[PDB]
From Swiss-Prot:
Residues holding Zn(2+): 185, 188, 215, 218
Family designation: Belongs to the CRISPR system Cmr2 family.
Lineage of source species: Archaea, Methanobacteriati, Methanobacteriota, Thermococci, Thermococcales
Subcellular location: Cytoplasm
Quaternary state and interactors: Part of the type III-B Cmr ribonucleoprotein (RNP) complex, an elongated RNP with Cmr2 and Cmr3 as the base, with Cmr4 and Cmr5 forming a helical core along the mature crRNA (39 or 45 nt in length), while the complex is capped by Cmr6 and Cmr1. The 5' end of the crRNA is bound to Cmr2 and Cmr3, while Cmr6 and a Cmr1 subunit (Cmr1-1 or Cmr1-2) cap the 3' end of the crRNA.
Full-sequence portion shown in this chain: 216 to 871 of 871
Free-text comment on the cofactor: Binds 2 Ca(2+) per subunit, this may not be the physiological cation. Binds 4 Mn(2+) per subunit.
Outcome recorded upon mutating residue 327 to N: No effect on pre-crRNA cleavage
Task of the protein: CRISPR (clustered regularly interspaced short palindromic repeat), is an adaptive immune system that provides protection against mobile genetic elements (viruses, transposable elements and conjugative plasmids). CRISPR clusters contain sequences complementary to antecedent mobile elements and target invading nucleic acids. CRISPR clusters are transcribed and processed into CRISPR RNA (crRNA), formerly called psiRNA (prokaryotic silencing) in this organism.
GO CC terms: cytoplasm
Protein name per the record: CRISPR system Cmr subunit Cmr2
Residues that coordinate or bind Mn(2+) 3: 327, 368-369
Cofactor: Ca(2+); Mn(2+); Zn(2+)
């Protein structure tokens, strides 16, 4: 209509914006902000035409639009990032470039507004710990330039059966129109820290919240959650990975319910600086080790002892958490495009949220992609359920990295990604879950399994009987360390007999059967690889440091 023309928007950071996150809050803010940029982009198209002009993503149920456009109060549903960094729409030929420069302008202006607000906020609350009339010093054109040039917005359009050809034309010409375009800070470390020119290093570090001289973009990342709290009334329930870890078997709920106030008291009794608003200032303070180590001694001893007694009664505290990353297999005629986009939107916005919350933290769900932080006891069932919904609403691969709470976030993320792309997606036929466990010890276990293994195993008397040995797993694992000379079946039978009341005839009978079934859904070229994968999986889910 009015010279119908297909338009494509691609927003990309010139640095690994999201991937550089040093903290859970930073990851959430990264993703949320990207989705937000795309929101501003799309606001122009909606303003000029309307929501039905945007083919992908479908705006039908989009929380950012319901909240920021229509003013509906959706509450905490605003906290998930649902908008991808790529979009296409139908517009009239004449509006095209106008829309282009308007989208660019609105994104620039939005980012600059956030930078300004964020500097005010930094000075007022003293993250930058310098004098209030030195605000101007931070608006020095260098920093603004960094904020302006950080995101590349590629807008392309072509005039309008062969539609599927010109969509890829826009993919191409767009992948063209993108590429052409002191001491760097302590979070990302790609770009210059603020005051990273004028001052000298050791001196510089002391200007900052704790020894951490943010760049303008990381400054923005840090303000953004208070900004969102301003606009909405909402903030993510779990601020750090430890708050997610602690949801294992309701550990933190239970501890809170019984010993919580006492713990806050003994913590405060150590120092008023460990407590804010009648709760621990950092959740890693639920760990004895944090007191025995990190960074009055008799009061800290009192706390350590109180916690240790607590563990004896309620069980040891979970230190591990799971990163779930999922991507649709082999995914890259307008009616069917709209129907596809509506199906993807409904998967992303409704189904995924429906399974995840409140059991964990859903960071991003958009297109064929999911990113989420989960307690270790929920990861498998959540992954599985999301795959089921995807198949109801067609294949999907996932990496799951189970990791120690002290592990650097960005490295854990790079690893989860690496499980997804470099492992699961290199299986013939794909449709695979790749599970990693990285122990604090530095030891790393991987198991590649088909989605059905989770079902079959959940339904098995074997799972039940494992909560018959943990030494069993160790023994057959030491058998497939390098292969058994007698072969795989003989080895299994033997170790089963060994690790198991004539009634056991049944048990050994059944278990050996189930195992065989399970070996069906473990990925590998040969039976020994399948046994290694399956028993690595079992070692992973039986691990007592990981599952206390
Ligand atoms: Ca894909
Ligand atoms: Ca993807
Ligand atoms: Zn930075």
């Amino acid at each position: 209509v009015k010279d119908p023309t297909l338009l494509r928007i691609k927003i990309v950071p010139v640095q690994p914006f999201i991937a550089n996150s040093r903290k859970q809050l930073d990851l959430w803010a990264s993703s949320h902000l990207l989705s937000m940029l795309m929101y501003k982009a799309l606001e122009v198209i909606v303003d000029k035409f309307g929501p039905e002009h945007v083919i992908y993503p479908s705006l039908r149920d989009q929380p950012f639009f319901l909240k920021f456009y229509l003013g509906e109060n959706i509450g905490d549903e605003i906290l998930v990032a649902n908008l991808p960094n790529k979009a296409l729409a139908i517009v009239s030929g004449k509006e095209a470039e106008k829309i282009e420069e308007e989208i660019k302008k609105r994104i620039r202006d939005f980012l600059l507004q956030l930078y300004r607000e964020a500097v005010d906020w930094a000075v007022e609350n003293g993250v930058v710990k310098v004098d209030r009339s030195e605000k101007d010093s931070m608006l020095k054109e260098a920093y603004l330039k960094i904020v302006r040039e950080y995101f590349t917005v590629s807008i392309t359009w072509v005039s309008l059966a062969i539609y599927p050809l010109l969509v890829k034309i826009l993919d191409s010409l767009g992948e063209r129109k993108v590429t052409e375009e002191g001491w760097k800070c302590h979070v990302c470390g790609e770009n210059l820290a603020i005051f990273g020119d004028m001052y000298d290093h050791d001196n510089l570090k002391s200007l900052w919240l704790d020894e951490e001289p943010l760049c303008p973009m990381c400054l923005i990342k840090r303000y953004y959650p208070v900004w969102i709290r301003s606009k909405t009334g909402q903030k993510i329930r779990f601020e750090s990975v430890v708050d997610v870890a602690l949801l294992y078997k309701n550990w933190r709920k239970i501890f809170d319910e019984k010993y919580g106030k006492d713990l806050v008291s003994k913590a405060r009794e150590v120092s008023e600086d460990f407590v804010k608003d009648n709760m621990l200032v950092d959740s890693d303070l639920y760990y004895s080790s944090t007191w025995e180590s990190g960074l009055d001694e008799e009061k800290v001893k009192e706390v350590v002892d109180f916690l240790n007694a607590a563990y004896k009664e309620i069980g040891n505290p979970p230190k591990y958490y799971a990163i779930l990353v999922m991507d649709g297999d082999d995914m890259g005629t307008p009616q069917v495009h709209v129907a596809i986009s509506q199906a993807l939107a409904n998967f992303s916005i409704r189904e995924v949220r429906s399974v995840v919350k409140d059991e964990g933290l859903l960071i991003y769900a958009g297109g064929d992609d999911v990113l989420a932080i989960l307690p270790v006891d929920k990861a498998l069932e959540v992954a599985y359920k999301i795959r089921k919904e995807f198949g109801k609403s067609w294949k999907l691969s996932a990496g799951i990295l189970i990791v120690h709470y002290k592990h650097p976030l960005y490295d854990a993320l790079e690893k989860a990604r690496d499980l997804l792309n470099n492992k699961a997606k290199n299986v013939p036929g794909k449709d695979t879950l790749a599970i990693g466990l990285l122990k604090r010890s530095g030891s790393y276990y991987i198991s590649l399994v088909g989605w059905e293994l989770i079902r079959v195993f959940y339904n098995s008397e074997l799972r039940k009987k494992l909560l018959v040995g943990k030494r069993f797993i160790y023994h057959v694992l030491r058998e497939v360390d390098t292969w058994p000379k007698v072969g795989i079946d003989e080895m299994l039978k033997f170790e089963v007999i060994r690790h198991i009341k004539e009634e056991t005839k049944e048990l050994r009978e059944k278990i050996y059967g189930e195992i065989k079934d399970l070996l069906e859904h473990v990925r590998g070229n040969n039976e020994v690889e399948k046994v290694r994968g399956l028993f690595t999986f079992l070692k992973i889910i039986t691990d007592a440091e990981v599952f206390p």
